């Protein structure tokens, strides 16, 4: 069993009469009825509720999870879920993407660094004479404790509300392969350790959604290894799991993440889809950004590519 | 809140220093609390020795290499410092310090002198005061500069002027 | 081991003037730094915590600045009571001090008057920098009239048995 899901926002081409029926008719991809963005096969809830966050620069609902009001978040989340997915019977894939911060304190690097600072800054204002060891310990503790609370409670509420859906957080489990610090395709060792201690998340989720977006600034081999390493990590997690069988459906993009004017070549599609399939993923989801099909020219050009390259590649390796 | 350091006063090279800090208006069980031991030889800088948190977590100055032990007894409401292998360079006034939230509390300090010298009253000859032990000597003129004393043959020497 | 270097070792000023004493860290310590005043002592006294936050009941003339490796302590419009010693103390893990700084009260240049210790009193001179030669134990007082004094004692028992003084007033001893 292997199912590919269409999550490209081709609703944006409907105003020009481009409905993309061949996606399921010719290519066997699971597609919402009438190519609705949300429907019985798939539905993404982007940034629902009021997750605590730092929006570029203001603190929404506490800034960091350990200052957040859970009740307020859940109120608004319910409103959004009901708005976005009105049909109680929803059986499809439900993707939640909040993208504010990682539940592992350590993994809030780089752009996410402010979540570490503010966490630490609060502790220092209370205990000005604590040393860095104590402060770091306390900030980590508080952050991970309420960060889990916010992710776990939202998932629980989601399942309670739409109990037949297959829910997952976008991009989890993380892996961080092919970084300046982790130059192999293998996932970073400490992150694999940290993934094992996040059973609370992976036991509750129905579907793991690792993001396997390719980069142009990589070799042909590394693009395969980038994808292999992330699908391995998610498979390793899923096969250790006790509550249910967990689906691995990696998030896949037909653009190069760092070369957005360029569509994946025939060679990368074959090679990367063959790796996702051969490792035994249960399928994958094709994603796209609204910005790349916001003109009639771009819709017809995207459709040319679907029918000349993307569509055939899925059909001949997968379905 | 008040802190009182207590100690031997004087001891001989090679012996163990045992200093006790005693607390009033404050419990050492209170979460987020830390106590430090600091010292200052006369006419010189401050030196941090050790630190302990309410949950028995400890920090030590690796300079002391490491002849120090810090500990506490919550039920006695006291903190202790042991220093093994004292030599004359451990001569100083020793302070314990408490940190809770934004506030900082210091004791009055306990003077510790490390030497072999037998106790000795001074000869008055600012006035020249020669070969006495231990400190301090009071000098006034008719009911309530007098120069700081200095060690000669392990006995203090000093003078004053009117 | 994190080391703290304060500069300058001494700093002279008048009442009303503004000064900035400095404290540099060997490695980075984010903002884990305190400032302390010590008068002649009297035990030390908290001035600034978290590098920039003013301690309770301390005038606004004091203020702390910087982060990581370079910190400073500014004192505006100096009041007479402000003269004394000053220390920074990091607490990133260990919590070791800097060597400190003695804030001096600026005074008119005065020469030392000598009474021989044989004992020698080089009394009431400014500035503190002095030198003594015989023809020995050397001791010094803190800044008082705002002047310094020194003793020098040349011990020789009755069987066995001049005091020159160089200073930035005159080129010769005496």
XYZ file of C-alpha atoms in Angstrom:
655
model
C 0.000 0.000 0.000
C 1.297 3.378 -1.131
C -0.700 6.596 -1.421
C 0.432 9.937 -2.802
C -1.483 13.064 -1.712
C -1.990 16.331 -3.597
C -1.502 19.381 -1.416
C -0.601 21.902 -4.135
C -2.949 24.927 -3.898
C -4.298 24.653 -7.459
C -7.547 26.243 -6.193
C -5.635 29.366 -7.272
C -5.885 28.319 -10.909
C -9.643 27.612 -10.699
C -10.358 31.288 -11.528
C -8.794 30.612 -14.959
C -10.681 27.328 -15.430
C -7.746 25.071 -14.527
C -9.082 22.355 -12.256
C -6.256 19.773 -12.395
C -8.524 16.675 -12.635
C -5.748 14.620 -14.277
C -3.996 14.548 -10.902
C -6.338 11.759 -9.805
C -7.803 10.778 -13.197
C -4.507 10.129 -15.025
C -1.909 9.919 -12.241
C -3.706 8.174 -9.377
C -2.845 10.847 -6.817
C -5.311 11.193 -3.944
C -7.017 14.536 -4.511
C -9.774 16.337 -2.602
C -13.124 16.302 -4.430
C -13.340 19.180 -6.965
C -9.745 20.048 -6.090
C -10.784 21.926 -2.941
C -7.772 22.930 -0.809
C -9.384 21.223 2.200
C -11.590 18.162 1.937
C -12.030 14.470 2.587
C -8.457 13.348 1.645
C -6.332 16.117 3.167
C -6.535 19.382 5.099
C -3.803 21.574 6.563
C -4.416 23.925 9.481
C -1.694 26.599 9.242
C -0.879 28.328 12.562
C -4.286 27.593 14.141
C -5.352 28.897 17.515
C -3.056 31.235 19.427
C 0.161 29.207 19.946
C 2.613 31.231 22.052
C 5.118 32.824 19.644
C 7.421 35.707 18.718
C 6.160 37.326 15.482
C 8.691 39.532 13.667
C 8.869 41.660 16.911
C 5.963 40.971 19.317
C 5.006 38.322 21.909
C 1.754 36.531 21.090
C 0.173 34.673 24.025
C 3.244 34.829 26.252
C 5.937 34.716 23.566
C 7.225 31.383 24.932
C 5.035 28.369 25.900
C 5.906 28.637 29.617
C 4.216 32.054 29.759
C 1.220 31.000 27.635
C -2.483 30.707 28.374
C -3.505 27.181 27.254
C -7.220 27.846 27.661
C -7.057 30.852 25.333
C -5.125 28.845 22.741
C -7.618 25.955 22.810
C -10.653 28.241 22.501
C -9.308 29.792 19.295
C -7.982 26.457 17.966
C -11.470 24.915 18.242
C -12.939 27.914 16.385
C -10.355 27.519 13.620
C -10.685 23.749 13.338
C -14.501 24.092 13.103
C -14.114 26.877 10.499
C -11.509 25.056 8.402
C -12.739 21.430 8.724
C -16.501 21.769 9.284
C -17.360 18.138 8.582
C -17.203 16.085 11.820
C -16.628 12.850 9.780
C -13.291 14.031 8.334
C -11.293 10.767 7.680
C -8.321 12.193 5.721
C -4.842 13.427 6.586
C -4.884 16.343 9.021
C -1.732 18.409 9.087
C -1.008 20.931 11.817
C 1.765 23.417 11.173
C 2.517 25.918 13.939
C 6.225 26.355 13.153
C 6.834 28.740 16.087
C 9.395 26.691 18.043
C 10.731 23.207 18.697
C 9.640 21.376 21.889
C 13.308 20.511 22.438
C 14.925 23.594 23.992
C 18.372 22.874 22.456
C 16.966 22.688 18.878
C 15.774 26.335 18.874
C 18.794 27.513 16.882
C 19.470 30.429 14.607
C 16.259 32.246 13.658
C 14.637 30.410 16.607
C 17.334 31.628 19.063
C 15.031 34.370 20.547
C 12.944 31.621 22.194
C 16.123 30.563 24.114
C 16.976 34.183 25.074
C 13.533 35.201 26.367
C 13.285 31.892 28.285
C 16.669 32.588 29.897
C 15.946 36.304 30.350
C 12.884 35.560 32.456
C 14.877 33.247 34.756
C 17.664 35.849 35.208
C 15.194 38.615 36.162
C 13.854 36.353 38.941
C 17.238 34.942 40.028
C 19.921 37.549 39.137
C 22.600 35.680 41.140
C 22.059 32.169 39.689
C 24.924 30.866 37.534
C 24.513 29.867 33.888
C 24.259 26.151 34.678
C 21.233 26.719 36.968
C 19.604 29.229 34.637
C 19.973 27.016 31.567
C 18.599 24.053 33.573
C 15.534 25.989 34.714
C 14.775 27.585 31.321
C 15.045 24.189 29.617
C 12.832 22.511 32.231
C 10.084 25.159 32.057
C 10.222 25.422 28.271
C 10.099 21.686 27.547
C 7.412 21.043 30.179
C 4.914 23.596 28.823
C 6.078 23.188 25.223
C 5.023 19.553 25.402
C 1.817 20.617 27.121
C 0.893 22.971 24.255
C 1.725 20.481 21.470
C 0.168 17.453 23.197
C -3.052 19.191 24.257
C -3.684 20.616 20.780
C -3.210 17.178 19.232
C -5.526 15.619 21.832
C -8.205 18.268 21.139
C -7.806 17.742 17.393
C -8.329 13.966 17.734
C -11.233 14.363 20.169
C -12.882 16.702 17.667
C -12.143 14.871 14.425
C -11.578 11.303 15.681
C -11.379 9.525 12.280
C -8.692 11.807 10.916
C -5.018 10.927 10.619
C -3.365 13.821 12.454
C 0.272 14.925 12.384
C 2.537 17.911 12.979
C 4.312 19.146 9.835
C 8.090 18.441 9.685
C 8.353 16.093 12.717
C 10.552 14.172 13.303
C 13.402 16.531 12.614
C 16.814 15.201 11.700
C 19.107 18.068 10.562
C 21.244 16.081 8.081
C 23.565 17.858 5.582
C 24.253 20.913 7.734
C 27.653 22.644 8.193
C 27.731 20.798 11.567
C 26.333 17.426 10.354
C 27.839 16.932 6.859
C 26.628 13.343 6.322
C 23.178 12.251 5.173
C 22.765 10.573 8.558
C 20.709 12.475 11.130
C 22.450 14.236 13.965
C 23.107 11.844 16.848
C 21.718 13.958 19.704
C 18.487 14.618 17.720
C 17.946 10.844 17.357
C 18.422 10.641 21.141
C 15.959 13.509 21.580
C 13.434 11.929 19.178
C 13.410 8.809 21.344
C 12.442 10.895 24.379
C 9.595 12.499 22.376
C 7.458 9.341 22.398
C 4.762 11.543 23.982
C 4.391 13.174 20.573
C 4.950 10.218 18.237
C 2.663 7.913 20.203
C -0.215 10.442 19.888
C 0.286 11.355 16.212
C -1.191 9.054 13.552
C 1.147 10.184 10.748
C 4.801 11.340 10.755
C 5.470 14.174 8.292
C 9.150 14.738 7.705
C 9.897 17.565 5.291
C 12.109 16.213 2.464
C 12.546 19.348 0.335
C 15.556 19.160 -1.974
C 18.193 21.873 -2.388
C 19.953 22.836 -5.594
C 23.225 23.408 -3.673
C 23.825 19.698 -3.204
C 25.073 16.854 -5.390
C 22.751 14.310 -7.014
C 23.810 11.826 -4.351
C 23.278 14.187 -1.426
C 19.720 14.945 -2.604
C 19.016 11.237 -2.406
C 20.841 10.993 0.939
C 19.033 14.044 2.296
C 15.688 12.257 1.653
C 16.878 8.767 2.705
C 18.160 9.950 6.079
C 14.890 11.699 6.968
C 12.645 8.870 5.867
C 14.869 6.450 7.802
C 14.563 8.476 10.962
C 10.786 8.622 10.743
C 10.574 4.878 9.911
C 12.817 4.076 12.866
C 10.520 6.060 15.156
C 7.324 4.630 13.681
C 8.430 0.965 14.012
C 9.245 1.459 17.747
C 5.770 2.764 18.441
C 3.236 0.979 20.665
C -0.219 2.651 20.450
C -0.893 2.043 16.795
C 0.783 1.489 13.490
C 2.093 4.931 12.386
C 2.131 6.103 8.750
C 5.204 7.766 7.239
C 4.144 10.355 4.640
C 7.035 12.738 3.899
C 6.245 16.283 2.717
C 7.609 16.679 -0.823
C 8.108 19.802 -2.972
C 8.473 19.941 -6.783
C 10.648 23.120 -6.457
C 14.230 23.377 -5.168
C 13.997 25.133 -1.786
C 16.913 27.469 -2.629
C 16.153 27.844 -6.399
C 12.418 28.496 -6.457
C 12.285 29.475 -10.133
C 13.391 25.887 -10.937
C 11.383 22.644 -10.944
C 12.931 19.332 -9.910
C 14.512 17.536 -12.845
C 13.452 14.114 -14.144
C 16.620 12.576 -12.636
C 15.867 13.828 -9.091
C 12.208 12.773 -9.153
C 13.030 9.191 -10.174
C 15.946 8.940 -7.774
C 14.250 10.500 -4.742
C 10.848 8.813 -5.207
C 12.612 5.449 -5.624
C 14.333 6.062 -2.247
C 11.063 7.002 -0.447
C 9.383 3.929 -1.932
C 12.253 1.456 -1.419
C 12.647 2.392 2.250
C 8.951 1.538 2.668
C 7.304 4.884 3.326
C 3.501 4.628 3.147
C 3.413 7.349 0.463
C 4.104 11.089 0.398
C 2.413 14.468 0.046
C 3.165 16.867 -2.841
C 3.238 20.474 -1.553
C 3.403 23.765 -3.391
C 3.486 27.450 -2.510
C 0.753 29.897 -3.507
C 3.395 32.332 -4.895
C 4.400 29.973 -7.729
C 0.937 29.758 -9.276
C -0.432 33.287 -8.818
C -0.701 34.120 -12.551
C -2.402 32.423 -15.493
C 1.050 32.035 -17.122
C 2.345 30.287 -14.008
C -0.713 27.992 -13.757
C -0.269 26.837 -17.371
C 3.447 26.458 -16.848
C 2.934 24.457 -13.668
C 0.392 22.322 -15.563
C 2.846 21.716 -18.399
C 5.328 20.388 -15.796
C 2.741 18.207 -14.042
C 1.788 16.510 -17.305
C 5.346 16.306 -18.780
C 7.400 15.362 -15.682
C 5.808 15.191 -12.224
C 2.671 13.235 -13.080
C 4.429 10.495 -15.106
C 7.140 10.060 -12.440
C 4.565 9.397 -9.724
C 2.607 7.010 -11.929
C 5.615 4.942 -13.043
C 7.104 4.689 -9.552
C 4.528 4.466 -6.796
C 1.062 3.828 -8.314
C 17.937 38.828 57.821
C 21.309 38.497 59.571
C 24.419 36.353 59.069
C 27.204 35.608 61.596
C 30.483 33.975 60.645
C 32.309 32.091 63.410
C 35.719 30.438 63.449
C 38.810 29.488 65.452
C 40.399 32.974 65.312
C 43.959 31.640 65.061
C 45.384 28.250 64.008
C 48.688 26.664 62.966
C 50.010 25.866 59.462
C 48.758 22.416 58.217
C 45.567 22.395 60.309
C 41.958 22.350 59.035
C 39.896 25.587 59.091
C 36.260 25.047 60.138
C 34.035 28.067 59.591
C 30.359 28.259 60.472
C 27.820 30.723 59.113
C 24.615 31.135 61.169
C 21.396 32.647 59.812
C 18.519 34.581 61.421
C 15.253 35.709 59.855
C 15.863 33.202 57.053
C 15.699 29.451 56.315
C 18.304 27.682 54.159
C 15.559 25.368 52.849
C 13.963 28.210 50.822
C 13.938 27.434 47.083
C 16.248 29.491 44.818
C 18.650 30.428 47.615
C 22.467 30.391 47.482
C 25.277 31.045 49.952
C 28.862 31.965 49.093
C 32.104 32.075 51.073
C 34.408 34.991 50.319
C 37.610 36.231 51.934
C 39.806 39.305 52.071
C 43.349 39.604 53.432
C 44.015 43.019 54.934
C 44.852 45.659 52.348
C 44.026 43.408 49.400
C 41.247 42.219 47.077
C 38.233 39.971 47.515
C 38.531 36.234 46.800
C 35.552 33.939 46.096
C 35.967 30.442 47.626
C 32.838 28.314 47.231
C 29.085 28.438 46.586
C 26.157 26.203 47.568
C 22.503 26.235 46.446
C 19.426 25.241 48.438
C 19.523 21.726 46.847
C 23.129 20.955 47.844
C 24.596 21.799 44.409
C 28.134 23.183 44.851
C 30.689 25.419 43.108
C 34.404 25.715 43.972
C 37.200 28.051 43.027
C 39.708 25.810 41.221
C 42.430 28.157 42.498
C 41.992 26.485 45.924
C 43.068 23.227 44.328
C 40.924 21.936 46.063
C 41.361 22.142 49.812
C 37.766 23.393 50.239
C 34.545 21.726 51.262
C 31.219 23.598 51.487
C 28.143 22.098 53.115
C 24.955 22.951 54.981
C 22.541 21.557 57.541
C 18.988 22.766 56.935
C 17.762 21.716 60.404
C 20.662 23.509 62.169
C 20.156 26.402 59.707
C 23.922 26.679 59.120
C 26.527 26.583 56.384
C 30.049 25.193 56.851
C 33.402 25.690 55.151
C 36.371 23.359 55.635
C 39.867 24.343 54.419
C 42.549 21.665 54.716
C 46.330 22.320 54.715
C 46.137 25.984 55.732
C 49.305 28.039 55.280
C 49.952 31.764 56.068
C 48.487 32.804 52.678
C 45.024 31.708 53.959
C 45.219 34.486 56.580
C 42.240 36.782 56.008
C 38.833 37.894 57.154
C 36.237 35.452 55.835
C 32.669 36.432 54.867
C 29.591 34.311 54.126
C 27.078 35.863 51.734
C 23.405 35.101 50.957
C 21.584 35.718 47.647
C 17.802 35.495 47.354
C 16.095 37.153 44.416
C 17.502 40.621 43.747
C 18.895 41.093 47.275
C 22.362 40.445 48.727
C 23.244 39.917 52.435
C 26.732 39.829 54.016
C 27.937 38.880 57.484
C 30.292 41.088 59.518
C 33.146 38.669 58.899
C 35.404 36.509 61.011
C 39.138 37.127 61.192
C 41.340 34.053 60.699
C 45.091 34.091 61.318
C 47.398 31.273 60.259
C 50.740 31.150 62.032
C 52.907 29.255 64.494
C 53.557 32.271 66.736
C 52.857 32.114 70.475
C 50.739 35.009 71.796
C 52.749 38.049 72.968
C 52.066 41.561 74.363
C 53.855 44.456 72.583
C 56.863 46.567 73.550
C 55.999 50.292 73.392
C 59.167 52.195 72.415
C 55.905 58.881 67.769
C 55.619 55.413 69.382
C 57.224 52.262 67.918
C 55.318 48.979 68.510
C 57.569 45.954 67.909
C 57.167 42.153 67.893
C 53.613 41.474 69.129
C 51.093 38.745 68.245
C 48.233 38.627 67.343
C 46.505 41.683 65.871
C 45.097 44.217 66.786
C 46.892 46.852 68.859
C 45.169 50.128 69.855
C 47.319 53.283 69.890
C 46.144 56.694 71.152
C 47.878 59.824 72.495
C 47.157 61.179 76.001
C 43.638 59.806 76.542
C 42.421 60.110 72.938
C 48.663 58.436 61.650
C 49.239 54.901 62.949
C 50.708 52.787 60.120
C 49.429 49.291 59.258
C 51.420 46.514 60.908
C 53.781 44.245 58.983
C 55.139 40.741 59.742
C 58.753 40.422 60.923
C 59.979 36.999 62.118
C 56.277 36.017 62.283
C 55.604 38.883 64.758
C 53.856 42.160 63.957
C 55.715 45.509 63.838
C 54.124 48.961 63.756
C 54.468 52.671 64.576
C 52.420 55.859 64.970
C 52.848 59.631 64.799
C 51.337 62.783 66.319
C 38.794 29.062 34.387
C 37.296 32.492 33.715
C 39.509 35.409 34.746
C 38.377 39.008 35.346
C 40.644 42.009 34.689
C 39.602 45.418 36.025
C 41.315 48.575 34.883
C 42.497 51.028 36.039
C 44.087 49.954 39.345
C 43.771 53.567 40.607
C 41.752 56.561 39.430
C 41.870 60.132 40.832
C 38.973 62.594 40.557
C 37.221 65.572 42.168
C 33.685 65.879 43.511
C 31.336 66.642 40.588
C 33.417 64.806 37.965
C 32.322 61.656 36.096
C 34.394 58.482 35.805
C 34.197 55.078 34.118
C 36.022 52.097 35.593
C 36.261 49.013 33.427
C 36.076 45.230 33.841
C 37.080 42.764 31.083
C 36.308 39.021 31.037
C 38.659 36.325 29.675
C 35.771 34.439 28.019
C 32.159 35.473 27.301
C 29.866 35.659 30.353
C 26.729 37.108 28.729
C 25.386 39.424 31.493
C 26.426 37.355 34.538
C 28.277 40.210 36.303
C 27.849 42.224 39.508
C 29.349 45.520 40.737
C 30.349 46.182 44.333
C 31.483 49.202 46.355
C 33.693 48.811 49.419
C 34.398 51.783 51.693
C 37.170 51.964 54.290
C 35.951 49.898 57.147
C 32.677 48.282 56.180
C 31.885 45.128 54.192
C 31.220 45.176 50.409
C 28.009 46.662 49.010
C 25.924 45.642 45.966
C 25.610 48.361 43.286
C 24.589 46.640 40.037
C 23.178 43.182 39.217
C 22.497 41.496 35.847
C 25.271 43.800 34.459
C 22.930 46.844 34.043
C 20.202 46.630 36.736
C 20.674 49.116 39.582
C 20.518 47.586 43.090
C 17.981 48.785 45.667
C 18.457 52.293 47.133
C 21.417 53.367 44.997
C 21.655 56.764 43.264
C 21.009 57.110 39.506
C 24.494 58.617 39.032
C 25.735 55.013 39.100
C 25.039 52.857 36.020
C 26.408 49.678 34.404
C 26.848 48.866 30.726
C 27.971 46.353 28.111
C 27.620 42.601 27.672
C 29.659 39.439 27.073
C 33.332 40.331 27.504
C 33.544 44.122 28.092
C 31.734 45.881 30.950
C 31.936 49.343 32.509
C 30.615 51.257 35.524
C 29.913 54.967 35.097
C 29.683 57.349 38.052
C 28.190 60.783 37.220
C 28.578 63.900 39.396
C 30.783 62.284 42.065
C 29.754 62.908 45.680
C 32.399 62.802 48.490
C 31.099 59.454 49.796
C 31.773 57.740 46.423
C 35.554 57.518 46.934
C 36.694 54.043 47.913
C 37.214 50.688 46.244
C 35.156 49.021 43.514
C 34.914 45.386 42.398
C 33.244 43.449 39.604
C 32.329 39.795 40.169
C 31.248 37.391 37.437
C 29.022 34.430 38.292
C 28.771 32.487 34.982
C 29.702 29.275 36.852
C 32.523 29.976 39.233
C 32.182 33.510 40.568
C 35.616 35.085 40.822
C 36.341 38.778 41.413
C 38.436 41.310 39.530
C 41.399 42.906 41.327
C 39.399 46.025 42.089
C 39.953 49.764 41.752
C 40.696 52.506 44.278
C 38.913 55.735 43.415
C 41.194 58.539 44.604
C 40.216 62.015 45.760
C 42.202 64.474 43.595
C 44.264 66.892 45.681
C 46.958 69.546 45.385
C 50.487 68.220 44.878
C 52.234 68.174 48.282
C 55.783 67.081 49.228
C 56.601 64.630 52.074
C 57.954 66.015 55.370
C 60.485 63.601 56.886
C 61.041 62.739 60.570
C 64.007 60.395 61.179
C 64.339 58.559 64.526
C 65.719 53.603 63.114
C 62.317 54.965 62.099
C 61.432 57.269 59.188
C 58.085 59.070 58.694
C 57.505 60.377 55.156
C 54.300 62.123 56.226
C 51.512 63.816 54.214
C 52.502 63.746 50.520
C 50.572 63.806 47.236
C 50.430 61.831 44.984
C 50.840 58.345 46.524
C 53.844 57.342 44.355
C 57.009 57.409 46.503
C 60.486 55.892 47.016
C 62.693 55.534 50.130
C 66.421 54.693 50.411
C 68.643 54.288 53.512
C 72.254 55.282 54.294
C 63.963 47.295 56.011
C 60.148 47.250 56.359
C 58.009 49.646 54.265
C 54.375 50.424 55.185
C 51.790 52.835 53.747
C 48.494 54.402 54.858
C 45.357 54.765 52.752
C 44.423 58.234 51.506
C 43.494 60.340 54.524
C 43.534 66.248 54.191
C 43.532 63.688 51.301
C 47.297 62.965 51.658
C 49.366 59.785 52.009
C 52.027 58.858 54.562
C 54.675 56.140 54.796
C 56.761 54.549 57.532
C 60.150 52.917 56.990
C 62.027 51.040 59.725
C 65.683 49.923 59.600
C 66.193 47.414 62.427
C 69.737 46.782 63.658
C 70.429 45.437 67.172
C 72.529 47.532 69.599
C 75.735 45.604 68.783
C 75.651 46.063 64.983
C 74.265 49.613 65.105
C 70.073 58.790 56.523
C 66.617 58.442 54.957
C 66.363 59.575 51.296
C 62.948 60.150 49.648
C 62.238 60.466 45.890
C 58.908 62.051 44.838
C 57.280 63.797 41.828
C 57.696 67.311 43.347
C 61.496 67.691 43.214
C 64.198 66.046 41.090
C 66.474 65.330 44.052
C 65.916 63.139 47.099
C 65.257 64.767 50.472
